[PDB]
Design an enzyme around this catalytic site. Sequence first.
Site, PDB file in Angstrom:
ATOM      1  N   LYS A 184       0.851  -1.155   0.062  1.00 45.79           N
ATOM      2  CA  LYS A 184      -0.098  -0.064   0.009  1.00 45.79           C
ATOM      3  C   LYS A 184       0.908   1.256   0.079  1.00 45.79           C
ATOM      4  O   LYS A 184       1.420   1.341   1.026  1.00 45.79           O
ATOM      5  CB  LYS A 184      -0.932   0.010   1.201  1.00 45.79           C
ATOM      6  N   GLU A 260       9.800   0.605  10.693  1.00 44.47           N
ATOM      7  CA  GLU A 260      10.951   1.629  10.647  1.00 44.47           C
ATOM      8  C   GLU A 260      10.121   2.823  10.845  1.00 44.47           C
ATOM      9  O   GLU A 260       9.356   3.298  10.070  1.00 44.47           O
ATOM     10  CB  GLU A 260      11.534   1.663   9.307  1.00 44.47           C
ATOM     11  N   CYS A 294      14.024   9.954   7.644  1.00 43.07           N
ATOM     12  CA  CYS A 294      14.195   9.469   8.924  1.00 43.07           C
ATOM     13  C   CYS A 294      15.655   9.277   9.471  1.00 43.07           C
ATOM     14  O   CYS A 294      15.768   9.303  10.820  1.00 43.07           O
ATOM     15  CB  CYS A 294      13.799   7.812   9.068  1.00 43.07           C
ATOM     16  N   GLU A 391      10.986  15.106  16.065  1.00 38.56           N
ATOM     17  CA  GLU A 391      11.125  14.917  14.738  1.00 38.56           C
ATOM     18  C   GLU A 391      10.554  16.082  13.905  1.00 38.56           C
ATOM     19  O   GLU A 391       9.198  15.990  13.794  1.00 38.56           O
ATOM     20  CB  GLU A 391      10.603  13.339  14.126  1.00 38.56           C
TER      21      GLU A 391
HETATM   22  N1  LIG Z   1      10.742   7.561   6.819  1.00 35.93           N
HETATM   23  C1  LIG Z   1       9.827   7.468   8.192  1.00 35.93           C
HETATM   24  O1  LIG Z   1      10.002   6.757   9.004  1.00 35.93           O
HETATM   25  C2  LIG Z   1       8.993   8.527   7.821  1.00 35.93           C
HETATM   26  C3  LIG Z   1       7.936   8.623   6.870  1.00 35.93           C
HETATM   27  C4  LIG Z   1       6.941   9.673   6.767  1.00 35.93           C
HETATM   28  C5  LIG Z   1       6.573  10.385   8.005  1.00 35.93           C
HETATM   29  N2  LIG Z   1       7.195  10.235   9.023  1.00 35.93           N
HETATM   30  C6  LIG Z   1       7.120  10.934  10.297  1.00 35.93           C
HETATM   31  O2  LIG Z   1       5.255  10.904  10.273  1.00 35.93           O
HETATM   32  C7  LIG Z   1       5.076  12.207  10.571  1.00 35.93           C
HETATM   33  C8  LIG Z   1       3.412  12.436   9.836  1.00 35.93           C
HETATM   34  O3  LIG Z   1       3.567  11.985   8.513  1.00 35.93           O
HETATM   35  P1  LIG Z   1       2.365  10.976   8.250  1.00 35.93           P
HETATM   36  O4  LIG Z   1       1.116  11.306   8.913  1.00 35.93           O
HETATM   37  O5  LIG Z   1       2.001  10.913   6.719  1.00 35.93           O
HETATM   38  O6  LIG Z   1       2.779   9.613   8.480  1.00 35.93           O
HETATM   39  P2  LIG Z   1       1.970   8.133   8.599  1.00 35.93           P
HETATM   40  O7  LIG Z   1       2.649   7.228   9.544  1.00 35.93           O
HETATM   41  O8  LIG Z   1       0.768   8.440   9.063  1.00 35.93           O
HETATM   42  O9  LIG Z   1       2.028   7.458   6.885  1.00 35.93           O
HETATM   43  C9  LIG Z   1       2.950   6.387   6.624  1.00 35.93           C
HETATM   44  C10 LIG Z   1       2.039   5.430   5.821  1.00 35.93           C
HETATM   45  O10 LIG Z   1       1.239   4.940   7.194  1.00 35.93           O
HETATM   46  C11 LIG Z   1      -0.310   4.747   6.306  1.00 35.93           C
HETATM   47  N3  LIG Z   1      -1.172   4.891   7.608  1.00 35.93           N
HETATM   48  C12 LIG Z   1      -1.649   6.072   8.150  1.00 35.93           C
HETATM   49  N4  LIG Z   1      -2.280   5.842   8.967  1.00 35.93           N
HETATM   50  C13 LIG Z   1      -2.433   4.369   9.266  1.00 35.93           C
HETATM   51  C14 LIG Z   1      -3.280   3.567  10.047  1.00 35.93           C
HETATM   52  N5  LIG Z   1      -4.061   4.054  10.967  1.00 35.93           N
HETATM   53  N6  LIG Z   1      -3.228   2.186   9.922  1.00 35.93           N
HETATM   54  C15 LIG Z   1      -2.223   1.691   8.952  1.00 35.93           C
HETATM   55  N7  LIG Z   1      -1.548   2.462   7.953  1.00 35.93           N
HETATM   56  C16 LIG Z   1      -2.064   3.981   8.062  1.00 35.93           C
HETATM   57  C17 LIG Z   1      -0.232   5.575   5.670  1.00 35.93           C
HETATM   58  O11 LIG Z   1      -1.280   5.957   4.655  1.00 35.93           O
HETATM   59  C18 LIG Z   1       1.107   5.772   4.758  1.00 35.93           C
HETATM   60  O12 LIG Z   1       1.213   4.631   4.013  1.00 35.93           O
HETATM   61  C19 LIG Z   1       6.014  12.990   9.750  1.00 35.93           C
HETATM   62  O13 LIG Z   1       6.197  14.117  10.207  1.00 35.93           O
HETATM   63  C20 LIG Z   1       7.372  12.153  10.025  1.00 35.93           C
HETATM   64  O14 LIG Z   1       7.694  12.700  11.359  1.00 35.93           O
HETATM   65  C21 LIG Z   1       8.235   9.263   9.037  1.00 35.93           C
END
Ligand SMILES: NC(=O)c1ccc[n+]([C@@H]2O[C@H](COP(=O)([O-])OP(=O)(O)OC[C@H]3O[C@@H](n4cnc5c(N)ncnc54)[C@H](O)[C@@H]3O)[C@@H](O)[C@H]2O)c1
Lengths: 492, 492, 492, 492
Positions: A184, A260, A294, A391
């Site tokens: 996904k 991660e 990250c 972060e």
């Molecule tokens: N490389 C990484 O580890 C990484 C990547 C993106 C964001 N972040 C951190 O997250 C913060 C917010 O960004 P975000 O809201 O887009 O991250 P997120 O964790 O919500 O999204 C990452 C993935 O998780 C999916 N997802 C979201 N909610 C979910 C749920 N309830 N159940 C299952 N899957 C779900 C999302 O659709 C996406 O594919 C950022 O500020 C950053 O600090 C970290």
Amino acid sequence: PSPTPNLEIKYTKIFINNEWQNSESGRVFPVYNPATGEQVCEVQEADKADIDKAVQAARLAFSLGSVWRRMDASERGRLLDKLADLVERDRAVLATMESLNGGKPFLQAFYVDLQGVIKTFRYYAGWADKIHGMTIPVDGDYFTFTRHEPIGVCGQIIPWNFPLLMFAWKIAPALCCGNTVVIKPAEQTPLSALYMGALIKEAGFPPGVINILPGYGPTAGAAIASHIGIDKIAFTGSTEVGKLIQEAAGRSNLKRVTLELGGKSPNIIFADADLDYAVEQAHQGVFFNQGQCCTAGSRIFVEESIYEEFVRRSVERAKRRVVGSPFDPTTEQGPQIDKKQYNKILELIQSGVAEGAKLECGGKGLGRKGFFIEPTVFSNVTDDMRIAKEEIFGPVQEILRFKTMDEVIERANNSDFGLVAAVFTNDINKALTVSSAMQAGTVWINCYNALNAQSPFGGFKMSGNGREMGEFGLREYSEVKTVTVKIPQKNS
Amino acid sequence: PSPTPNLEIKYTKIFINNEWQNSESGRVFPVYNPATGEQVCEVQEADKADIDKAVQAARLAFSLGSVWRRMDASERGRLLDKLADLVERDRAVLATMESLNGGKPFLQAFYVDLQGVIKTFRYYAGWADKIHGMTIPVDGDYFTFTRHEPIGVCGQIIPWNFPLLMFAWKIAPALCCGNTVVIKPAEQTPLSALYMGALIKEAGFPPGVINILPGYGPTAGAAIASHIGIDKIAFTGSTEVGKLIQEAAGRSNLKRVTLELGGKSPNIIFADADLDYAVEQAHQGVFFNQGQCCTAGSRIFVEESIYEEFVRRSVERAKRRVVGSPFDPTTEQGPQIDKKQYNKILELIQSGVAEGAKLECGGKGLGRKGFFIEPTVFSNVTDDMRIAKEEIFGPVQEILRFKTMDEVIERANNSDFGLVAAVFTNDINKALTVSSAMQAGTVWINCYNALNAQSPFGGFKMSGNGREMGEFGLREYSEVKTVTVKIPQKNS
Amino acid sequence: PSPTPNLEIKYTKIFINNEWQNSESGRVFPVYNPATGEQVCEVQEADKADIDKAVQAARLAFSLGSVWRRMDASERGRLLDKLADLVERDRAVLATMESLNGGKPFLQAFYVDLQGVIKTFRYYAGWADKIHGMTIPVDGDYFTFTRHEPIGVCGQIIPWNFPLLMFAWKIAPALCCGNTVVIKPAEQTPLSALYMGALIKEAGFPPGVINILPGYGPTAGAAIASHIGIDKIAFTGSTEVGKLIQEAAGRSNLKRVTLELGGKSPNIIFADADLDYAVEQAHQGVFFNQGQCCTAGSRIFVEESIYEEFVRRSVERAKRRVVGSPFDPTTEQGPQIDKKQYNKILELIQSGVAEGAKLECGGKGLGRKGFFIEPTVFSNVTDDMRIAKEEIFGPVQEILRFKTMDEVIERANNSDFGLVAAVFTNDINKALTVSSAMQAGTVWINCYNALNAQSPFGGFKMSGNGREMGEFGLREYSEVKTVTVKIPQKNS
Amino acid sequence: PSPTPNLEIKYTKIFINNEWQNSESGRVFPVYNPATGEQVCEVQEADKADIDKAVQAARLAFSLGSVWRRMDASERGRLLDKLADLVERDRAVLATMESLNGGKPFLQAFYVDLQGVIKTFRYYAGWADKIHGMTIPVDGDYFTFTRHEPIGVCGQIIPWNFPLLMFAWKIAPALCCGNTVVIKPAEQTPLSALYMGALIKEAGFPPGVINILPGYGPTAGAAIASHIGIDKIAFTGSTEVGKLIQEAAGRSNLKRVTLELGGKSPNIIFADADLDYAVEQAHQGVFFNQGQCCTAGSRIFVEESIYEEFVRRSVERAKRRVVGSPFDPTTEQGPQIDKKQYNKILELIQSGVAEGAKLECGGKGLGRKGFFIEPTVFSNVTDDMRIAKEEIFGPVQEILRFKTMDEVIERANNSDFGLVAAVFTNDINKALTVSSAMQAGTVWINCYNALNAQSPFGGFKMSGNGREMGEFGLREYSEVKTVTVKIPQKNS
Ligand SMILES: NC(=O)c1ccc[n+]([C@@H]2O[C@H](COP(=O)([O-])OP(=O)(O)OC[C@H]3O[C@@H](n4cnc5c(N)ncnc54)[C@H](O)[C@@H]3O)[C@@H](O)[C@H]2O)c1
Ligand SMILES: *[C@H](Cl)C(=O)NCCCCCCCCNC(=O)C(Cl)Cl
């Protein structure tokens, strides 16, 4: 290389069993260019019903005696190498799509992200027929050996900051080991993943081995996390959602979980470091990929005697960093991914001013279309500030000072995160003492963000669990079976 | 050997930082003899306040520069060997305690459980200074290596069916890797674990490296599972609590989780097997340890042409199985652990009769005192009966018939569990085809319950996460760190 | 596919530093077609002075800082994969050359030999960046790791029975590990090796990394074995010459030595084997490649009760075996390599008749041009006969009878050789008992001559030392260096 | 500890099949104290007839079905641990023997040699049940695995400079892997090895598993090297004899061969090293064990700017080095082993004077009884001097000067030897560049002679073949067998 002129977005449907499908509900969702805010296309919106169809296809493709299960391991490897060939052929197209959809400067997507994708597929192409079990000199009259089998149907959830690279990091080891996949992509950035479905079909993967489900987190992502027919989940994203994933695995079918998550990684600069080199490494270490990484070195600890000069040089560098259109070759920094992330960054910048950190440069959005923020440098950062603990995921550098090695080791480790760390010094004793003491999954000595297909990567503490890349990346994608055979008489 | 005469229970307190402590509340809890119902002694009851003290002790013992961190790995191994020597010295005492408290026949506790304890310590004693990382020929001008460090404070929760053996299975790999431990024995069976605290102190482990916290599940156990200062949890017990443990890990601090849970393991008997051997192996495979074993071969599939003879012989064997006092050397079967387990078995037996399985023998409690149950055999069992699906953990054998290999593979694998499996046949092709097709973590060929310190053990599907024993048991108790050093020029 | 029409031999010179050179002496030697006796071409004759120039080129190419030393390990792997692509492109040409020069039926060289060549290069392409050293938890305040470096200049001597396949088996692991190579094909069969030099240059290997030196044994081969500038030698050939190789290494510079030498391998058929299958497998196991194969199953032991029927079926199969022109698609058996080998075979056949073995069919040359021998079957062979002890390397099958498993294990192991063995039975206990008791480097169960790039191969006893193929094939081509760094304070 | 008063030499006979035997000839040979020249005792003199009896005993102990072959691997480990316990019990007796017989100062024999013996046995005790083969995902419908078997009868020849330590280094891995042993101690120093026979019998090794044959080189040693019933030979000693061993293996039965031979190892001191530390480490690195050590740092290269100070401090240290009675606790340096070695050292010292090296101190014999030599320092040594090229094996330190890193790397590597190397510097980049560039089997950084049971050890180039200690030490004592099973249908 130049961005592909007038890039057609051809693949916007759900990819299940090597066929392009509409969503069961008929719903679609818009996809945007973060540099202009304009809608690029619409994409079929997967929900729980589409996940169930994908899991059924992945399960059937994994059945004993299927094409994918009977295939020589060396031929799984050949398919990964063919996929790398196709990515290399289409490198400029995919880098254009990564730039258009994700806001990455095109030349960075072409030379960094896409190089990582190709190298990842070629690396794991080589592992497929080199995954070995063991034979064991157990007590008693037995012959004992282990089989390292694929786990089964692997659900994979990836974020928007490295859409294509994370897609490759996830599917390469899973396929290397013989699994089938329901993946996904982030709702912000489904496009390059869907293009990969076309290359997966063209390379000849059997139907149902990779299924690609664009959609939202609370709907499609949550359906994967709770599915009782998915054997393993891998998630890269926020720490908050990581917790939800692990909780949902425990409430459902105890699927195996790797995560991660966030970091707040320390970058430690001793006074004997080369300043031309360390300043630029530390600059890239926090500003790379619009700060959306990250691994960002967001706590730079600088030995007192070089602190003022380090700050001085870092501010000069940030003031020079070129923000602009991702397709322009002179652009170093594109926009942030969306308005939510843009607002999150500015709120943390405001908290840093309010808590008394010294704003050296930047600190505001640019007034343009899209979500662009000035390269921002804070100095006099202290450990209890919100910007020193949370972060940011934006173009915000934070510089702290330290006096002694024991002090900086303690402060660097005083974090709930532990993704990466770095130390810059020529002194061998300090380098090895600091790197051994760090509570972090990767420690760089005299470099930053040096990642390679061959070396494992992952978090200590709440930055995650499991490793990706390298040989150890395979361990999360196999299930160990012990087979113990009674024999009439054992001899050594 | 003979049970130790008039065994007095010397160690009844909480073991923290190598000192014997009262509970913070002042409460004690009773410990009983399952063969008589009599109270044996009272033990200090740990709760959250005691867990907090133990985690602090374990964290201090794990601090950089501590005695346990600075010790040579080979000297960690020497301490495990010394512990094995002390267990060997006190083997009769400990076996008496396991029989008195757990209901195991004394000779089985002496020759099976205590042998496994000693061999487990001696095996992991040899691993400590052989845990290796790697050096990696990464792309670019870098020197890359991995360090395999201990994780930190490991919380361990173990059950009442193999109190001492599971104690050893848990602490041996954790200590071998250099972790510190907070371990909670089952409230039914704390006594041998507390005796182990005395031997741990006598062997010379640094204070705080092992802390032993007797107490109940929702108090002491839940305090371990949700503790924010515990890096890793290992749990052996029911599937239901395993689900709660994994949820609590996600909700609290994302601690790493391994689980060994329920099974409903198949044992497949082909008509060309050695029949009298298969009958006895399948009998032990169900009835060993009062039936209270996660590996129980509780679905015996017998090829139709030998089914009637297999049943007749199995019934004869179960009718002569000697049930009686654990201290009597003729006793093959002791009591069940407590009234709750006793009642659960009786209710499942009633369900088998109600759903039309053929009660061949047994089926009732034996005597008035303690928790003894007649060895029970059901034939004509079919796959949708409750006794074919639910883990009984009592002396109840289920015999099913099958016609073809393809059929029995499908029926064996049609389970949410996947802990072990066995196949009995003299045909090499049948044995390898069936064992390769099983969805189980251990498959025996022409044997049952052949477990060795050298070979890994654990579940597929909802029978668990991770492996124990062997080299692979170490992988759950280390954290991998990658160190990447920039160098002026790389040569192969 | 069909043989390349009118095959011209383009490459006939010495290949040093990616250049085509004349012999230093100016001498050339003829190369023949064993099916007609006609001269195919002349080839430059390498001698000691040419070996010396090649070693100098290989040494310079191995210098620190050279292109080959500085290259990423993954890029060494890409070069092996490019070489595989080129072999595949030129597969029919190469198979034609192996057929014309070596006597192999074209279709066999195309579908067997050339497939092995391609699979070997592709397999080792994947290992180059997966060769790992270790990090070690030594006693004391030290950080200890190992580097697995290439050895240096490797001398390789190969025989005439699999000219191109053995060329690949040798150079692929050596290059995988980063070595440079001086390789000496057999004087009967230099042509495909020289063609590979053109492909090596085309693929982009740096000059001097592979040097190919056609010439005679006691001249060019001896100069390699005694060279003081060669670090490692690998030899495949006669046991007699292997002894001279190991002696010459001891007398000269103690270069590392691996050897693959003679065999007289046993093939054990129990009475429950499928005769249709086992007769054909044992037939191919002796007769494959004109009988000129180290793995030949030249002692077939058949359980008494099926011995007569096995002999009957074997004779029928040998009588229908088609001998003729290698280019004819119907040909199963080509000629022997040359007159010397032809005469050796016939003298051993005459010894068999003289010592009383029963000549069932064959036994004579075919009397046409070239070196063709009738497929020959001996029954009633006993262990003391010359044909039961001496490697024949021709189309001569020997069938012995046995009664018990104890007996046949002892007779099978009563050999100074121990390259390969096989057992045909469906009984799992006999299969594992026999395979475990064999003193042989490869044991097949219910097959023969099943070789794979992933599986190590090599001799027990005087059949050789070291292993080739698989991961273990790499161990002979690297040198282990331990680096031990003093550190201020070790922590686990 | 103190030397054992009134040391009786109890064990003076040949040890075969756990029995004490007279020599077949009836001859005994004298054994001397190198500190006084006095005869200590006489020992039965083994020759070819005694070797033959020992090989027969070792062969019988290795036969399939024997006690040693059927023993659990874990029980082979228990026997090694028991042997370690007995050595620890008798540590002072054994150290007194090594001092009396070998001339080692007693405290050094007690704290260095005997600690190494004990740690070696304890380390390999832990490996025996952890020697694993692999299961391999080969192409085609096969199940393929490897078994790692013991080779068979291993001949071992050891020298006089570390009699007991080298005995342990040889038999520990051999026995760990399940081999049987015929071991010949040096004629100068048989006593501690014979005492080990008594401990081997007391520990309970089966008869014939270890046979100890005291005797001379051309008689007992050559009989081993040439024996057609010995499968593997390991030799530690002179380069010249090592060449003869490898030639004799080739001429006789192609037995497998490992060698540890001479060195002329470089020790590189940069100006940024800790100078007093480097002086003391480099002093020990050449003077340890009377200079009689293969690892001696006999080419010390000192960066020009610290050269004169380094020389002055090294001369001061050598002038205070205490030479005297090995039983005296003030003694740092005992005598050389015998008159032949004494004279060889004196002649090489004269060579250094004649060729123009600066004799800073020492250079003559000490006293009139025994074989004591003054600690000797040469400065202004150049690469072409005999003392810079020939292994001295005496208390003779050589100091060279260099100016650049590239120069010192080239000079250090310009040698036919390559046993060990060291670099002293606080600069991480120089340390890793130099250690990576060294052509040596062990490279120390900021230490010297840091040897550990966990770390493999052995030569590049003419310093030997193979590795000892660590996991890799086991690879020379096992034979790999590949077993490949045809299966009906392969699934991943
Ligand atoms: N490389 C990484 O580890 C990484 C990547 C993106 C964001 N972040 C951190 O997250 C913060 C917010 O960004 P975000 O809201 O887009 O991250 P997120 O964790 O919500 O999204 C990452 C993935 O998780 C999916 N997802 C979201 N909610 C979910 C749920 N309830 N159940 C299952 N899957 C779900 C999302 O659709 C996406 O594919 C950022 O500020 C950053 O600090 C970290
Ligand atoms: C002695 Cl080394 C010898 O004659 N060896 C050749 C045996 C060849 C068997 C048939 C060819 C096998 C082709 N396959 C491969 O090469 C795999 Cl890649 Cl191992």
